[PDB]
Design a protein around this ligand. Sequence first.
Ligand SMILES: [Mg+2]
Ligand SMILES: [Zn+2]
Ligand SMILES: [Zn+2]
Ligand SMILES: [Zn+2]
Lengths: 114, 65, 43, 49, 56, 49, 262
Amino acid sequence: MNAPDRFELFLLGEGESKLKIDPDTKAPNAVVITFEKEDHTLGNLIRAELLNDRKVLFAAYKVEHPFFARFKLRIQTTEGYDPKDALKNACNSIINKLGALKTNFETEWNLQTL
Amino acid sequence: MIVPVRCFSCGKVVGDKWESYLNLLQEDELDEGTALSRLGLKRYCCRRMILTHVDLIEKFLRYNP
Amino acid sequence: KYICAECSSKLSLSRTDAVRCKDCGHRILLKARTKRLVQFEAR
Amino acid sequence: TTFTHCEIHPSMILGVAASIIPFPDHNQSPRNTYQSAMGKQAMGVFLTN
Amino acid sequence: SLHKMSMMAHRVKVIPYSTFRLNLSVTSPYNADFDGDEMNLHVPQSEETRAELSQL
Amino acid sequence: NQEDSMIMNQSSIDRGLFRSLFFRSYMDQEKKYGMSITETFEKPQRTNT
Amino acid sequence: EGPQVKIREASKDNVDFILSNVDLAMANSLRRVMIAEIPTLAIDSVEVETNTTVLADEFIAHRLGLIPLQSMDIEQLEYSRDCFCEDHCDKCSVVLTLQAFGESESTTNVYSKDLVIVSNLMGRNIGHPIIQDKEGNGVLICKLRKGQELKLTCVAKKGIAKEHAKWGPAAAIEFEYDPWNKLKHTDYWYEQDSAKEWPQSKNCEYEDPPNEGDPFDYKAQADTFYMNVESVGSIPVDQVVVRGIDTLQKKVASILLALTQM
RNA sequence: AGUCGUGCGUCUAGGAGAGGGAACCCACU
Ligand SMILES: [Mg+2]
Ligand SMILES: [Zn+2]
Ligand SMILES: [Zn+2]
Ligand SMILES: [Zn+2]
């Protein structure tokens, strides 16, 4: 009778920002990025890419509740390294890897007659 | 009533082969497993979706309306 | 405005009129679906 | 060594609801009773008309 | 309400579903098993009642 | 799924899993309270009501 | 170089391949986007004008929704919620009409092919019902008896499987890695012998069997993921994976754009 | 091996709401 709006899971609500970045006082140079209308798909990949970087120290993604399509990513890097720059670099690396994988798959499919 | 359009577990379309399944069972007198394998159902989800279905639509159509 | 359960023939009877089918003695007298537009979704 | 009579099949002792239970012996008796009680509340086609 | 701990104050959390949701642990004092158990929620209607529920 | 609870696939739920049709029938009669007086099946028009 | 794809086999609606030099998280995200984030076309709205079948309007509408529809040119199509239209304009929706009725003593079977496209597709091969059975009839929809008239209209919108499973372009997406227990990710449950109880996986032949002499490799990480993608029929498996990769890349780009804007 | 019987139909565009007790039976935690 009051089931959640299914489309609302992946659609931003009125007056809602896609990303909300706030500082974290638990540790120095730590930030919390709340992703709205997102699932484990992007959070896990972004966190895995972040952990692959030596400069990045801590990168953890948490889903508060399955009901709400939203998660929070805590990122802490070394001194003098802005976490937003690290996230941007991780996203760029993910895009490059995805493009390379797409090109390889297309080449393999073209090579195969079937 | 009618065979489900897609498998509940995976979502594979299984409604196309219900008539083929019945024809194989009757025309070729093949066993359930062999007919299902020939139709192209590997995962047991679709196997039980097709095998366990009951054609109540025909029984409902038996009535005049 | 109405149909017979067996004959399935339209009657279009009015008020202060018998509710029995004209073709047969059966008087179930089912009613046809509303003419108003109806929409449904697979969700 | 006499056995003047014999059962056609023991499983027939079960009732309409109990017979629906797969492997009733493999299950505990209170669970079988609960299943028999609950089967009356299962939603399904009761008649074709 | 077999025992004293069968009626306890909880902080409301609005959720978009038609079922009450409670912590796993509080099932033990309530003797709940989520097999169709139906529970009751009573909303206080005064500051006195709210304070008493929160503190007692 | 603790305490015997279960987790059901949303995709299966919306794909035709355990969907049900509920039919409820209401019956009405023009039972006569006094000869020459009977109820009438008509849409009220707010007049004299 | 990056990650490379080794297609072990390919088919009309089933492709089995291997991904190498890729992280487990990336493969899992690719699978998730391919199963959920790929746009697809499916019947969304059903308008009933004259229905008298034994079935119910909601039941038949739900059955129609699950009917696959051609979505090769789905990218060209735009979401209805996006374009400024009154309701289901030709630029954001596909309109089909279903008409049928029985006769003296022959039951009328309604299939996918019975659906007739009524809207203007502007030369786009999108919305055509998918037919794969040898007979070519399609997906059985319902059965009509003498005097049972079925007459309805179907409007299909662009959407993703997340909103409803009917938009799912892939039925089963098998994903495996580490056939031999090299990474100790799984502790096989055994009663007499672990190897005997658990049969060797098919992919095991593609990796060297472990040798008891060498010690456990603690530096090893998940790699060489065997992925088999099966398509319902709306989109071919190759296009399915391509669109999944495109959707994931677009989501990452949107995240980057939001970060830059904020 | 070079030709042939058979059929069809005639008129259509103007503002607002409020209410059943007892008994019996089934069933849930
Ligand atoms: Mg209980
Ligand atoms: Zn299946
Ligand atoms: Zn009649
Ligand atoms: Zn539009």
